[PDB]
Design a protein around this ligand. Sequence first.
Ligand code: WE8
Ligand code: WE8
Ligand code: CL
Ligand code: CL
Lengths: 304, 304
Amino acid sequence: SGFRKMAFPSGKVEGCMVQVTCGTTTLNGLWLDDVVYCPRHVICTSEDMLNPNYEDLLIRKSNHNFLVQAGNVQLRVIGHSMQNCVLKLKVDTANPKTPKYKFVRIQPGQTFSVLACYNGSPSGVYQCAMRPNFTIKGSFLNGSCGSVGFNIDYDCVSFCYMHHMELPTGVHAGTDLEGNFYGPFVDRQTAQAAGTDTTITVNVLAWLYAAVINGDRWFLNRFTTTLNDFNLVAMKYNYEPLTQDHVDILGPLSAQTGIAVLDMCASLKELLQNGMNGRTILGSALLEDEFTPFDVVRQCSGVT
Amino acid sequence: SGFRKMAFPSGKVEGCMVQVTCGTTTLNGLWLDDVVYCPRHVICTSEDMLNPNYEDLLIRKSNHNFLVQAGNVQLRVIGHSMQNCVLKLKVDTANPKTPKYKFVRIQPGQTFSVLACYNGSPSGVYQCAMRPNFTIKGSFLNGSCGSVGFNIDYDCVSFCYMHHMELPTGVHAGTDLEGNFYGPFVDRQTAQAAGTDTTITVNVLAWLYAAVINGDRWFLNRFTTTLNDFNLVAMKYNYEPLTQDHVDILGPLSAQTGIAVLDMCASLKELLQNGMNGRTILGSALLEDEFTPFDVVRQCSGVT
Ligand SMILES: N#Cc1ccccc1C[C@@H](N)C(=O)N[C@H](Cc1ccc(Cl)cc1Cl)C(=O)N[C@H](CC(=O)NCCCc1ccncc1)Cc1ccc(F)cc1
Ligand SMILES: N#Cc1ccccc1C[C@@H](N)C(=O)N[C@H](Cc1ccc(Cl)cc1Cl)C(=O)N[C@H](CC(=O)NCCCc1ccncc1)Cc1ccc(F)cc1
Ligand SMILES: [Cl-]
Ligand SMILES: [Cl-]
């Protein structure tokens, strides 16, 4: 029993974290085999940051300008390239702790674990969703750029996020591991605004199913709604439209609990219209949207 | 910026998790040097669980009755003993991945990270507080007994919790790594009730300071309260008495934010009496008490 925001065990990623330094600028890098991946703005000075031409700044760099530190031992750089907004440094040593891994680019509404690091050294791990406006609501201080987000599937590490910047609003923006930003953002020090955010409807519904699996039923009701009548209410409360694909993704949870998806949508409608009136769901006094249906299945019992 | 429930990186503990089997009963063990630690009820059958005499059951065991599995390789047991409610199995191989570690017994209100494991294999990590009634509100399924809770201090792993059982109310009870239960509980399959729980006042105050460090101030007010007048309100809302030691522990946070502790207590009083009226603090619609002052300092910026 119980339900908590649960991160993946971080050990496989811990063995990959290193430190990359260019001038007086240090951030974190990811060491897989004989390549170190880090944000390309490590090659910028505080001057260059306002509007850099990275192709210009990189052609003025040599290999020995990059200091890569894996714990105590320096790694010698033997080659460097640029792939979108990530720098790739070839080094003369393969990481012996390299896990099975892949790089994947995720969709908004999907979750991952963040290993927050400072000077190449892990400090903590937490769970995040990619918001619909392509930011994450992270916990990051100066020095954390280069930290990665990841999922784990049967000892294969799927890296999906590299941290590049905090926006003026205090939320966080970054790229996949091939350097492509999530959302419209660019890697320069200018005030950039994210689009207006929305609530991830399919995830709220998954979390209501988690609550039922855990024995909490107070929010259920005898009613059902049509998908279209639900979305009219969803739109009014700044919730994402629910699609037939979302309905089908919630199939397993519906089947384990005997509550039809559109049945659960009528509960969500009533909760949006009337609030909770002082009650809590899984220890929360608001509707939580950072658990995917996969997250719920992974953590909850297969029997209600 | 940002504030999230943050676990310690779990890699150092991942390398210690093993599987212990006695009869048809399997749970998790902790492998440090040449000793495996696990809950002693692994030697019980479903019959024995109602009211076991463990000294009786253990003297009827031999070393070869214990199957210890570290990944794929079996570890050969060469000796076994009992220390309170933990079994200790000597094995013929020292764990090469043994970190620097110690065993510590914590106070209620302190937090730790849980590495949830099944069949010796880590599945996830989350943060927990030891409740005032000595339970934890964990997330555990069948098979998780043997999972450990821990803090990390400068690459030294301080193990503080081993998981032994879920109570009929769905909360969780266990021991320190020397086998002493937290709270009044015993390791037998009977319905056991925990004392009535209370809210950890010093932690709520720490979390209000986290909110101020992160730029949220809406709950402050111009008033102060005396420690005794605060506790009269605390008692009315089932909050723990606040001690002068708690006041002094919150010294650093008070100093970083310029808000006197008793000033913050007047904010807490007003929040208890009037609620939040639809507003949130650090993304929460209730007052959160599972962050210690140490947790706040560790995660938040040293500058407001
Ligand atoms: N994580 C993180 C982090 C956090 C603090 C310091 C440092 C770092 C990492 C570090 N690497 C990094 O992100 N620095 C970028 C500058 C930058 C570097 C490189 C690149 Cl490519 C782009 C950018 Cl923008 C950074 O300083 N951002 C500022 C962070 C900041 O002051 N927030 C205040 C939050 C206000 C608030 C909080 C809560 N509620 C409401 C409001 C915001 C900002 C300021 C000017 C600007 F013009 C663009 C952005
Ligand atoms: N974690 C965990 C876990 C969770 C589920 C299954 C198995 C395990 C691990 C496993 N190892 C283990 O804990 N089994 C013990 C039995 C036991 C083994 C060994 C020892 Cl030493 C002591 C005890 Cl008590 C266990 O089955 N408990 C029950 C778990 C349970 O049904 N909860 C229902 C929750 C109801 C609820 C939920 C939410 N909101 C309100 C109410 C509760 C219980 C039942 C009878 C009894 F008499 C004592 C306790
Ligand atoms: Cl794809
Ligand atoms: Cl002590």
